Structure 1
Amino acid sequence: SITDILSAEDIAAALQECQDPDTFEPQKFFQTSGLSKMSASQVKDIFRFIDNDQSGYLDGDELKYFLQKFQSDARELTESETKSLMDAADNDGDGKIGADEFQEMVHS
């Protein structure tokens, strides 16, 4: 589980940092949560928990509910914040985030 990989305190800190709407920034979240320090294998396990429909890609509602995978009572991302996530990750113009793209974004 995500819980088996990141510390609960770092997750709590990351959510605290982006409590107000339109303050989520991918890079800050990945740093505060500790995701940017994890190995490729650990980042892939997190990717699998976020990919709710097991399509192999993050898209649609999975972006809006991104924080909710870390704590089920977290807020939804705004449309602007979901666009920031896609802008940060997409490199092949398909409008979805593959596992490779996720790894590259997290480690940036």
Structure 2
Amino acid sequence: SITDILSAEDIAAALQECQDPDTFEPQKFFQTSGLSKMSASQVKDIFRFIDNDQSGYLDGDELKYFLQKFQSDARELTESETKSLMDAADNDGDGKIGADEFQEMVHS
């Protein structure tokens, strides 16, 4: 979902740095460790971190399930955590985070 092409250690720190239900559990994981200096392609694999697609794209509602996808026992990114994901790409006019949208953030 990310380890395809990324620094494994930096991931933990990247994630574990400020992680919490309101700081940036996914974005930090990606950015600090991986996204910071990665091409668009690998982002495809990274993108897989959050939701897979569900119906063509990921959305603020579903974003909480990203953990419930594999861990099927997540906390549901609380009210705040999904903000991270929401703010991850299509936040200003779609509230959805798709691979393309996600790629846009790193490319931004």
TM-score relative to the length of structure 2 = 0.66
How many equivalent pairs are there?
108
Q: CA deviation at 1:51?
A: 3.2
Provide the alpha-carbon RMSD of the alignment.
3.5
Is 2:50–2:67's contact at 8 Å kept on the other side of the alignment? no
User: 1:103 matched to which residue of 2?
Assistant: 103
Change beyond 3 A, Cα 1:55–1:105: same
Change beyond 3 A, Cα 1:39–1:47: same
Change beyond 3 A, Cα 1:15–1:72: farther
Note the residue ranges of structure 2 that are not aligned, 5 or more in a row: none
CA distance in 1, matches of 2:18, 2:24: 5
Change beyond 3 A, Cα 1:19–1:93: closer
TM-score relative to the length of structure 1 = 0.66
Change beyond 3 A, Cα 1:103–1:86: same
